[PDB]
Amino acid sequence: MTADLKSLAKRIYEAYLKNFNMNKVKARVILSGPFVIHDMETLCMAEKTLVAKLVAKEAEVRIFHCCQCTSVETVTELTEFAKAIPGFANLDLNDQVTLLKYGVYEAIFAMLSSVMNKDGMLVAYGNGFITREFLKSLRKPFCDIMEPKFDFAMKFNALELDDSDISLFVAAIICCGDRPGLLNVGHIEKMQEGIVHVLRLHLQSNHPDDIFLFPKLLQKMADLRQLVTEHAQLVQIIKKTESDAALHPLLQEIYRDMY
Numbered sequence: 001m002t003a004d005l006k007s008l009a010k011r012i013y014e015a016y017l018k019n020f021n022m023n024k025v026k027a028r029v030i031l032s033g034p035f036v037i038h039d040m041e042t043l044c045m046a047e048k049t050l051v052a053k054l055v056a057k058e059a060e061v062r063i064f065h066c067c068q069c070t071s072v073e074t075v076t077e078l079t080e081f082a083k084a085i086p087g088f089a090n091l092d093l094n095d096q097v098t099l100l101k102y103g104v105y106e107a108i109f110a111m112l113s114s115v116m117n118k119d120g121m122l123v124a125y126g127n128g129f130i131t132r133e134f135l136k137s138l139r140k141p142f143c144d145i146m147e148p149k150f151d152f153a154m155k156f157n158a159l160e161l162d163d164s165d166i167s168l169f170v171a172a173i174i175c176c177g178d179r180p181g182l183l184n185v186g187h188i189e190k191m192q193e194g195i196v197h198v199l200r201l202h203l204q205s206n207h208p209d210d211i212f213l214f215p216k217l218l219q220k221m222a223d224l225r226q227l228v229t230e231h232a233q234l235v236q237i238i239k240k241t242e243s244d245a246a247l248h249p250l251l252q253e254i255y256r257d258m259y
């Protein structure tokens with residue numbers, strides 16, 4: 001790992017720490033000992049303290065709206081982060097849009113793992129914790145949203161990545177040269193090759209104990225693509241069949257023509 005590649009890995013790590021409100025160290029500090037949402041009573045209490053304006057509709061629909069707000073926010077964070085990736089800001093604007101379009105939910109579900117344990121997830125900028133069992137207790141189809149994400153996260157967390165790894169993994173997610181509709185595939189593939197090269201060398205240095213960590217992470221990227229495809233299908237069912245579950249226009253555009 002040359003000085004330029006080590007420097008690039010650190011540059012991406014610092015951009016991640018700057019641009020995402022939550023990181024794995026911060027999440028672990030909080031989780032070690034947030035208001036616990038484990039039933040309808042505590043959900044309603046948390047709404048009045050953490051999202052007061054929202055309740056100043058069915059609980060499931062209220063949760064869905066709050067989730068959309070966090071997704072919109074995360075799109076902003078990921079867009080700023082992408083500027084630290086060598087060559088991203090030099091791409092055609094349309095290609096930057098396409099890469100973020102397909103990458104954002106893969107990145108969201110990867111980063112969600114940092115705030116998940118087997119019992120639930122940290123939410124609302126670190127100020128709430130919503131139990132996995134409470135989410136399973138919601139009426140269909142809303143109880144079907146988070147469980148596959150918990151399943152992904154438990155195995156992803158067993159890899160014991162830190163933020164220096166996760167930042168590069170998120171950058172690699174964004175730099176996929178095989179997204180549909182790309183204009184300058186050749187330059188993107190070169191951008192992808194560079195980020196993946198940095199990721200491979202970083203994992204060799206930071207995880208000398210796990211000689212297969214790089215191919216494990218390539219597989220996780222493929223798993224995330226499938227998780228997002230399935231997630232988009234469920235969101236389409238909810239939007240179409242739930243008269244009160246309208247989609248924020250920015251998210252409508254992200255999901256539109258995706259899969």
Ligand SMILES: CC(C)(Sc1ccc(CCN(CCCCC2CCCCC2)C(=O)NC2CCCCC2)cc1)C(=O)O
Binds near residue numbers: 123
């Ligand atoms: C909205 C769909 C249509 S479905 C969908 C998508 C994502 C999620 C996870 C949302 N969430 C819980 C947000 C829970 C808010 C809480 C609800 C109860 C009352 C207090 C506030 C959360 O913390 N996300 C992190 C954000 C920081 C970066 C990593 C991801 C849930 C459903 C979509 O976007 O596709």
